[PDB]
Write a protein that holds these residues in place. Structure first.
Motif, PDB file in Angstrom:
ATOM      1  N   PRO A  28       0.768  -1.244   0.000  1.00 41.22           N
ATOM      2  CA  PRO A  28       0.000   0.000   0.000  1.00 41.22           C
ATOM      3  C   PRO A  28       0.804   1.302   0.000  1.00 41.22           C
ATOM      4  N   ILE A  29       1.815   1.412   0.859  1.00 39.44           N
ATOM      5  CA  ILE A  29       2.597   2.643   0.894  1.00 39.44           C
ATOM      6  C   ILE A  29       3.299   2.901  -0.443  1.00 39.44           C
ATOM      7  N   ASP A  30       3.766   1.843  -1.091  1.00 42.96           N
ATOM      8  CA  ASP A  30       4.436   1.992  -2.379  1.00 42.96           C
ATOM      9  C   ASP A  30       3.415   2.342  -3.453  1.00 42.96           C
ATOM     10  N   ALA A  31       2.195   1.829  -3.298  1.00 44.01           N
ATOM     11  CA  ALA A  31       1.132   2.127  -4.260  1.00 44.01           C
ATOM     12  C   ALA A  31       0.748   3.597  -4.131  1.00 44.01           C
ATOM     13  N   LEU A  32       0.703   4.094  -2.898  1.00 46.13           N
ATOM     14  CA  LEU A  32       0.377   5.491  -2.655  1.00 46.13           C
ATOM     15  C   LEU A  32       1.508   6.370  -3.193  1.00 46.13           C
ATOM     16  N   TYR A  33       2.747   5.945  -2.964  1.00 48.51           N
ATOM     17  CA  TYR A  33       3.881   6.728  -3.432  1.00 48.51           C
ATOM     18  C   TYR A  33       3.843   6.835  -4.953  1.00 48.51           C
ATOM     19  N   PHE A  34       3.645   5.708  -5.624  1.00 48.60           N
ATOM     20  CA  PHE A  34       3.593   5.732  -7.082  1.00 48.60           C
ATOM     21  C   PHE A  34       2.487   6.677  -7.551  1.00 48.60           C
ATOM     22  N   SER A  35       1.329   6.600  -6.902  1.00 50.70           N
ATOM     23  CA  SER A  35       0.217   7.456  -7.287  1.00 50.70           C
ATOM     24  C   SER A  35       0.587   8.930  -7.161  1.00 50.70           C
ATOM     25  N   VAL A  36       1.251   9.276  -6.060  1.00 46.36           N
ATOM     26  CA  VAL A  36       1.645  10.658  -5.815  1.00 46.36           C
ATOM     27  C   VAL A  36       2.701  11.188  -6.778  1.00 46.36           C
ATOM     28  N   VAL A  37       3.783  10.442  -6.983  1.00 46.74           N
ATOM     29  CA  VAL A  37       4.823  10.941  -7.883  1.00 46.74           C
ATOM     30  C   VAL A  37       4.361  10.919  -9.338  1.00 46.74           C
TER      31      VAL A  37
ATOM     32  N   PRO D  47      13.865   6.376  -6.293  1.00 48.17           N
ATOM     33  CA  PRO D  47      13.058   6.832  -5.158  1.00 48.17           C
ATOM     34  C   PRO D  47      13.619   6.406  -3.801  1.00 48.17           C
ATOM     35  N   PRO D  48      13.084   6.980  -2.718  1.00 51.03           N
ATOM     36  CA  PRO D  48      13.542   6.636  -1.364  1.00 51.03           C
ATOM     37  C   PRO D  48      13.347   5.136  -1.146  1.00 51.03           C
ATOM     38  N   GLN D  49      14.204   4.522  -0.333  1.00 48.11           N
ATOM     39  CA  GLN D  49      14.099   3.090  -0.072  1.00 48.11           C
ATOM     40  C   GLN D  49      13.360   2.778   1.231  1.00 48.11           C
ATOM     41  N   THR D  50      13.298   3.744   2.139  1.00 46.15           N
ATOM     42  CA  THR D  50      12.615   3.523   3.420  1.00 46.15           C
ATOM     43  C   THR D  50      11.194   4.070   3.405  1.00 46.15           C
ATOM     44  N   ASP D  51      10.320   3.478   4.215  1.00 48.42           N
ATOM     45  CA  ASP D  51       8.946   3.956   4.285  1.00 48.42           C
ATOM     46  C   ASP D  51       8.899   5.385   4.825  1.00 48.42           C
ATOM     47  N   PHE D  52       9.781   5.694   5.769  1.00 42.87           N
ATOM     48  CA  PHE D  52       9.842   7.035   6.319  1.00 42.87           C
ATOM     49  C   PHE D  52      10.192   7.981   5.156  1.00 42.87           C
ATOM     50  N   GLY D  53      11.134   7.555   4.322  1.00 47.59           N
ATOM     51  CA  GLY D  53      11.524   8.372   3.186  1.00 47.59           C
ATOM     52  C   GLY D  53      10.361   8.596   2.233  1.00 47.59           C
ATOM     53  N   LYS D  54       9.585   7.549   1.984  1.00 47.94           N
ATOM     54  CA  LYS D  54       8.450   7.681   1.074  1.00 47.94           C
ATOM     55  C   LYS D  54       7.388   8.619   1.629  1.00 47.94           C
ATOM     56  N   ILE D  55       7.057   8.455   2.906  1.00 47.07           N
ATOM     57  CA  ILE D  55       6.049   9.305   3.526  1.00 47.07           C
ATOM     58  C   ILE D  55       6.472  10.771   3.545  1.00 47.07           C
ATOM     59  N   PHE D  56       7.707  11.031   3.970  1.00 48.33           N
ATOM     60  CA  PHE D  56       8.197  12.393   4.010  1.00 48.33           C
ATOM     61  C   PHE D  56       8.162  12.997   2.607  1.00 48.33           C
ATOM     62  N   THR D  57       8.626  12.234   1.620  1.00 54.47           N
ATOM     63  CA  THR D  57       8.663  12.727   0.250  1.00 54.47           C
ATOM     64  C   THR D  57       7.286  13.143  -0.249  1.00 54.47           C
ATOM     65  N   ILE D  58       6.272  12.338   0.066  1.00 53.96           N
ATOM     66  CA  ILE D  58       4.903  12.657  -0.333  1.00 53.96           C
ATOM     67  C   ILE D  58       4.507  14.017   0.238  1.00 53.96           C
ATOM     68  N   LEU D  59       4.724  14.209   1.538  1.00 54.31           N
ATOM     69  CA  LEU D  59       4.385  15.485   2.156  1.00 54.31           C
ATOM     70  C   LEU D  59       5.274  16.622   1.641  1.00 54.31           C
ATOM     71  N   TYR D  60       6.555  16.322   1.440  1.00 56.44           N
ATOM     72  CA  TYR D  60       7.522  17.307   0.966  1.00 56.44           C
ATOM     73  C   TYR D  60       7.103  17.832  -0.410  1.00 56.44           C
ATOM     74  N   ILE D  61       6.654  16.933  -1.281  1.00 55.27           N
ATOM     75  CA  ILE D  61       6.217  17.328  -2.614  1.00 55.27           C
ATOM     76  C   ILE D  61       5.028  18.285  -2.531  1.00 55.27           C
TER      77      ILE D  61
END
Ligand code: NA
Ligand code: NA
Ligand code: NA
Ligand code: NA
Ligand code: NA
Ligand code: NA
Lengths: 90, 90, 90, 90
Positions: A28-37, D47-61
């Protein structure tokens, strides 16, 4: 306005998260990330591997890009602008 | 307007699909996908491998980016906006 | 206007081509391609490998993105728009 | 205006540099590069490899894209435009 663009953006991302986690088999988190970027055009991730994924993504981009940037053009234009602007007043 | 941007966007993508499938040897769906993510700037796929592909892509970007976003700035501004806006009326 | 944005865009891309071919060791066409997809934000190619390349790219993006899109917002707004618009007249 | 967008852009990039160097373990220059290509949507890096990285990136964007382009829409609209415009006067 902002609250509405907020909700619309949310639903769009929720749909993307469900779609990619199911069809492309992403966590899910990767699916959300892909959707966002994808919708913000950052597109830093590998593309979908399935034809269904490619087709959906094409439609997802055309229908969601406008909404996502409209929201962004408010999150900083009608929410983050004042917070900084008004404070720039001695 | 919308219908015209619709058609113009279609022709541009058709040309891209034919070009990449022929010169870069992509399956049609992959050629269409590349055309779409390139013109919307998502660019999540590997770049063209041939010089002809690189040159065409450079010109394709400059001539098609404006059109694609103009269409997008209508698909949600003159078609998806009302559908949601008018309904936001109790 | 258009002719001036034309020239300014050209010089910017020429500088990018010279820079990446020299510092990142790219063939000229690949250096030009990288310059183009970077400034248009398509960014479908691997990033620079040298620190000099990374630093230059950061500055190149900030100084060239505005110009490139300004030109694009004319190549289709003041050149490709009429050609299609006027012809849309029976 | 420009000076303020200048500073705001700086702080945003500084935060990104600190975040990615710490959580994603990137060298500072690479952390800054990732921050820049992400917010400008070039997104040419993995892209970021950690979930923390993915979450932060989403908000950062979402929080930084508006600011970065606002600044860009001034660095060339209120600083680079005149320099070239006024000089275009015989
Ligand atoms: Na991009
Ligand atoms: Na990209
Ligand atoms: Na990429
Ligand atoms: Na972009
Ligand atoms: Na990319
Ligand atoms: Na890769």
């Amino acid at each position: 306005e902002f609250q509405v663009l907020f909700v619309l953006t949310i639903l769009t991302l929720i749909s993307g998260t469900i779609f990619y986690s199911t069809v492309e088999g992403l966590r899910p988190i990767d699916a959300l990330y892909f959707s966002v970027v994808t919708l913000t055009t950052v597109g830093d991730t590998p593309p979908p591997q399935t034809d269904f994924g490619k087709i959906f993504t094409i439609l997802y981009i055309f229908i969601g890009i406008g909404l996502v940037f409209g929201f962004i053009h408010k999150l900083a234009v009608n929410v983050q602008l004042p917070s900084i602007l008004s404070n720039l007043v001695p």
